[PDB]
Write a protein that binds this ligand. Sequence first.
Ligand SMILES: [Mg+2]
Ligand SMILES: [Mg+2]
Ligand code: NA
Length: 221
Amino acid sequence: KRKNSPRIVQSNDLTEAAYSLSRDQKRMLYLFVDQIRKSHDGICEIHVAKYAEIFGLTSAEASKDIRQALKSFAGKEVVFYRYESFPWFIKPAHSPSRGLYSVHINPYLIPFFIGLQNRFTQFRLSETKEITNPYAMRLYESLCQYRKPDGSGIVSLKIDWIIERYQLPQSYQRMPDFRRRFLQVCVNEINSRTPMRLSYIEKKKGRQTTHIVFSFRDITS
DNA sequence: CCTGTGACAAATTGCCCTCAG
DNA sequence: CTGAGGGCAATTTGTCACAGGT
Ligand SMILES: [Mg+2]
Ligand SMILES: [Mg+2]
Ligand code: NA
């Protein structure tokens, strides 16, 4: 089963937001949104020991992952559409005791994490915790936004949108590099590392490729 | 314009080791 | 013991020249 992993549930506004976070920062961001989703002033807490347990890390590496990611949030903003930009943190994180980190999520991000009535993305945390490339995590979440109860779905993602919201590096505006370093890589991780089985076709307009059309089912069928 | 691939650079990985308390 | 440090080599991601229209 996967029912025992924490059910991550985020607004589509966040699934579609424009930002650049590392894998480690997105791993924590899941836990933050989960904490905020379960009650708020934006003040969340990471334990090194539980982070290590969740993500299959040693204490030392989980301490390292968390400390370095927390420092890297500074200067990072997230832009929400459907244009509004917010800093993720409004205070540096601090450790009030060994193994514990207190973080100050911008309380104006809370609605954007929670979202509207039925416009949300859900996945068990187990589905995303073995993905390594943060862009593959972005792709996974977008796919999950269109997932049906039976774990299947189909969605056309425009490439300029992917580039803008996932904030892909500039060289991936060259479509061969997009294919090789983003698309094939992230689809391979999802197939290798999640319960989702994913294929895609490219949509052309004249000489250009404009959209990637993703179709997926769950291994459980 | 478009494509894929080789080559190189930068980033990131899981590991390793030390040591304070 | 944990976890806050500093460190590593191998691997992956990010970039671009070049060759050719597959
Ligand atoms: Mg609180
Ligand atoms: Mg790490
Ligand atoms: Na790597």
